[PDB]
């Protein structure tokens, strides 16, 4: 799909919310972005919809510098939060219910 990439070089919005605002009017027909953002935008705008099926299903993640002592403990805390139900509560508070 390298030629596809060429068609994305003429237009490439240097922001994230700017492209959504542009799509609000008929200036950019199709946007391609992470699902966890587009879904919230669709839920909170009631004017845009998500089409297709998810591809490249790789999740988010806290970063850290290579060879850093924080990796093990940060990963452990994230997993404990996932199991504890904290992440579900956070998603309900800040993403869903719009």
């Amino acid at each position: 799909l390298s030629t596809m990439y060429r068609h994305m070089e003429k237009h490439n919005y240097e922001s994230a919310a700017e492209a959504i605002q542009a799509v609000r009017d008929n200036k950019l027909h199709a946007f391609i972005w992470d699902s966890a953002v587009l879904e919230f935008e669709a839920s909170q705008k009631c004017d845009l919809v998500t089409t297709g099926e998810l591809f490249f299903r790789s999740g988010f993640g806290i970063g850290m510098r290579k060879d850093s002592p924080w990796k093990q403990n940060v990963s452990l805390s994230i997993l404990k939060s996932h199991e504890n139900g904290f992440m579900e509560d956070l998603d309900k508070t800040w993403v869903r219910y719009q």
Partner: protein
């Protein structure tokens, strides 16, 4: 070519003890004292190669005026004649390159080899970090290159390799860049005078880091710098000279015996521009020669042309000279040892404006933005974040950031006992590799990799081209790329 005219007195006895053990020819050894006229030694070596037909030369000299002066002209003359010369009492790394000195064989390891000893010592106590402070000279650059490649072999980029300007006063500014780091293990490699000057400078500035791990070279622990030497850790047996001279004489005798094939020395020192065709083979056989009967231990060499597997002596307990450590060539409450690195508690975090995750709002006139309540009647935690304005200059104005990832960061801070100071990104792009004019990272990844960052708490995706240089925690939300379009208006 002789020091104090005392080695030459026993040189004849050493030659005779090894001359017969025979036949072939009998080489006559001549020695000339070092001169500053830079002319007399040329005539002396011309006479030696004309009458005595010397097949090699020997270099050994006390400190005197600057050490890297005396052997250079004799090495240059040898390179003109393509005749090997054995050096002693000099361990400068500049002689390790054969491009300038085609015919120069050194039997004493240079300062660059001490990088391997430092690596071994690092492996002894299992230190996962290291700080390098090398003088900006050829020897320092060579040592730094050797240590860098040796460490990159084990897949670990060196942390904060620095450069220190030699022959300069008030180098305390370098310590300004060497105080807020995260490792207590530091290695210092400079000239003896430079080491003494930097030690004295640390003495008046009194932030010496006394009682903490330091790794220095033999020159840095010299007696001249020992007067103002702070807490130290490298001693070499050669510093005897007579033993090395005898070993070299034995090596030459063995090479001569095995040589028995033109081997015609230049009878006339002047008047002939031709070189010795046998000379390259002579140098090759010395490089490939093995001398297991050396007085000063094993006399094996390497590809470069320097002896290996030397005597390494390792603490500075009030000018002590105790070799507690154990290392001979291949032998692979606080020492003036603790953990090499001390973790910081002032992590700087980089965040990018993403609508569902990291809301950014302008502050109020007082300085803190208006507090808000959620639909459930609970406070919404917000953190004052310093970020660029406009997208047109680049002016930083403190706004307030909140939302999902900020809540996660707060929970992490509560559960980990570490403070934080969030700081938005400058360019605004997440991060990718871009060709310059070699490729460089730009975006948040640029801030995290080398800039002012320690963590990147932002909706950052995970993929192969990013995980190569950045460690990724376990995911905290799953997703996938998808397409957004405008719904058709409906009667």
């Amino acid at each position: 070519v002789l020091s104090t005219r005392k080695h030459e007195q026993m040189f004849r006895e050493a030659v005779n003890q090894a001359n017969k053990r025979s036949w072939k020819i009998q080489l006559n050894a001549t020695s000339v004292t070092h001169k500053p006229n830079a002319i007399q030694m040329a005539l002396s070596v011309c006479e030696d190669l004309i009458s005595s037909q010397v097949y090699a030369i020997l270099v050994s000299h006390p400190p005197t005026p600057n050490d890297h002066f005396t052997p250079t002209p004799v090495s240059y003359t040898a390179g003109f004649y393509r005749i090997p010369v054995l050096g002693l009492t000099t361990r400068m790394s500049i002689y390790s390159d054969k491009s300038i000195h085609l015919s120069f064989l050194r039997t004493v390891p240079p300062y660059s080899h001490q990088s391997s000893v430092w690596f071994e010592m690092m492996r002894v106590y299992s230190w996962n970090h290291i700080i390098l402070l090398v003088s900006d000279d050829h020897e320092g650059r060579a040592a730094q290159k050797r240590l860098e490649t040796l460490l990159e072999e084990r897949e670990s980029k060196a942390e904060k390799v620095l450069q220190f300007d030699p022959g300069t006063k008030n180098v305390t500014a370098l310590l300004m860049e060497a105080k807020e780091l995260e490792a207590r293990v530091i290695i210092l490699s400079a000239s003896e005078d430079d080491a003494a000057t930097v030690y004295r400078a640390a003495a008046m500035l009194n932030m010496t880091g006394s009682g903490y791990v330091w790794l220095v070279g033999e020159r840095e622990i010299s007696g001249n710098a020992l007067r103002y030497a702070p807490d130290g850790i490298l001693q070499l047996i050669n510093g005897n000279e007579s033993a090395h001279i005898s070993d070299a004489v034995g090596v030459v005798a063995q090479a001569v015996h095995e040589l028995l094939n033109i081997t015609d020395p230049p009878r006339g020192c002047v008047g002939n521009t031709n070189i010795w065709k046998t000379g390259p083979l002579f140098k090759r056989v010395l490089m490939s020669s093995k001398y297991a009967d050396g007085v000063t231990g094993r006399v094996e060499f390497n590809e470069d042309g320097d002896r290996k597997f030397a005597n390494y002596s390792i603490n500075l307990q009030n000018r002590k000279l105790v070799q507690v450590g154990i290392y001979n060539g291949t032998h692979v409450i606080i020492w003036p040892k603790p953990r090499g690195y001390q973790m910081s508690t002032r992590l700087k975090i980089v965040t990018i404006h993403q609508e569902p995750f990291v809301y950014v709002k302008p502050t109020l006139s007082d300085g803190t933005c208006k507090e808000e309540f959620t639909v459930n009647g609970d406070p919404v935690k917000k953190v004052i974040c310093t970020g660029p304005n406009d997208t047109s200059p680049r002016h930083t104005v403190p706004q307030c950031c909140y939302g999902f990832c900020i809540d996660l960061l707060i929970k992490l801070a509560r559960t980990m006992n570490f403070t934080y100071e969030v700081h938005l990104v400058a360019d605004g792009k997440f991060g990718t590799q871009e060709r310059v004019n070699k490729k460089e990272w730009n975006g948040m990844m640029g801030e995290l990799l080398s800039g002012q960052a320690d963590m990147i708490v932002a909706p950052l995706t995970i993929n192969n081209e990013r995980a190569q240089y950045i460690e990724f925690s376990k995911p905290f939300k799953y997703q996938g790329l998808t397409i957004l379009v405008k719904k058709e208006i409906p009667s």
